[PDB]
Curated annotation (Swiss-Prot):
Protein name according to UniProt: Carbonic anhydrase 2
Additional note from the record: Target of drugs used in treatments against glaucoma disorder and breast cancer.
Signal peptide range in chain numbering: none
Residues that coordinate or bind Zn(2+): 91, 93, 116
Description of how activity is regulated: Activated by X-ray, histamine, L-adrenaline, L- and D-phenylalanine, L- and D-histidine, L-His-OMe and beta-Ala-His (carnosine).
GO MF annotation, one: cyanamide hydratase activity
GO annotation, biological process: angiotensin-activated signaling pathway; carbon dioxide transport; morphogenesis of an epithelium; neuron cellular homeostasis; positive regulation of cellular pH reduction; positive regulation of dipeptide transmembrane transport; positive regulation of synaptic transmission, GABAergic; regulation of chloride transport
Gene behind this protein: CA2
pH effect on activity, per entry: Optimum pH is 6-8.
PROSITE patterns in alphabetical order: ALPHA_CA_1, ALPHA_CA_2
Effect of residue 64 to L: Reduced activity
């Protein structure tokens, strides 16, 4: 199936998922000088106080930290959003080198990784129904640059040994995602899609201007993960990012 290899990577996805060449695909390059400041954009409201993390899983494409989304515990609202969006999971995209790894780029600059906090619109009842709507998901994207260590990321880094291969999972309770946020909530926003198959155009993207800093040791551990399952040839889970797609008929708005 699809992946990030030379034979099944992003350039091949359109064959099984034609929407790959759609009108509102993600990620995109954020041209800071062309983005339009929108004074009507409200401040973001991130309420992760009652977040309930459950487990961490290696799904063969990335590792996801999953949350209990049966109630409005951890939610995103405000900004360009209308309604309440519940946090269901977060994961990252990273490179084989510090010079690449992010999906979105800023003035063509690639960051070492990119965190995606995925939320779905409660007006649609469940995640499955939400992905079928143009405003079904809200994904908060946060860039990672290599520098000082990120304390709030260490609990994640330390459990990676227990989910090295595809299909592995581990309990991951009491993890506070607030420890992954930068100081500033200034952001760019635009309508887009999932960056992985099925590439549905159901995402309101909110990308934070301020990256978080992580250490070389922390990102290096991400690169020790495996795309393959136990008992199969080892394939290092690196460069699980889709390159920037055509902006087409869209305008990126800035909150600042
Ligand atoms: O492209 B991304 O890595 O970035 C942002 C993002 C958000 C959600 C996902 N997909 C999830 S939670 N399930 C897969 C699925 C989705 C829709 C239908 C079937 C199956 C992947 C990504
Ligand atoms: Zn993602």
């Amino acid at each position: 199936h699809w992946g990030y290899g030379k034979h099944n990577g992003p350039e091949h996805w359109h064959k099984d998922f034609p929407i790959a060449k759609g009108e509102r695909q993600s990620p995109v390059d954020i041209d800071t000088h062309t983005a339009k400041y929108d004074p009507s954009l409200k401040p973001l409201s991130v309420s992760y106080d009652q977040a309930t993390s459950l487990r961490i899983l290696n799904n063969g494409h990335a590792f996801n930290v999953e949350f209990d989304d049966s109630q409005d515990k951890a939610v995103l609202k405000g900004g360009p959003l209308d309604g309440t969006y519940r946090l269901i999971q977060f994961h990252f995209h990273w490179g084989s080198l510090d010079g690449q790894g992010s999906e979105h780029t800023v003035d063509k600059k690639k960051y070492a990784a990119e965190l995606h906090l995925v939320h779905w619109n409660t007006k649609y009842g469940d995640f499955g129904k939400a992905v079928q709507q143009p405003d079904g998901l809200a994904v908060l994207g946060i860039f990672l640059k290599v520098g000082s260590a990120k304390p709030g990321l260490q609990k994640v880094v330390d459990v990676l040994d227990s989910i090295k291969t595809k299909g592995k999972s581990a309990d991951f309770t009491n993890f506070d995602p607030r420890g992954l946020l930068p100081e500033s909530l200034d952001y760019w926003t635009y309508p887009g899609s999932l960056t992985t198959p099925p590439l549905l155009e159901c995402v309101t993207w909110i990308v934070l201007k301020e990256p978080i800093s992580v250490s070389s040791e922390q990102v290096l551990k991400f690169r020790k993960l495996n795309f393959n399952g136990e008992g199969e040839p080892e394939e290092l889970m690196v460069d699980n990012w889709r390159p920037a797609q055509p902006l087409k008929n869209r305008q990126i708005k800035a909150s600042f």
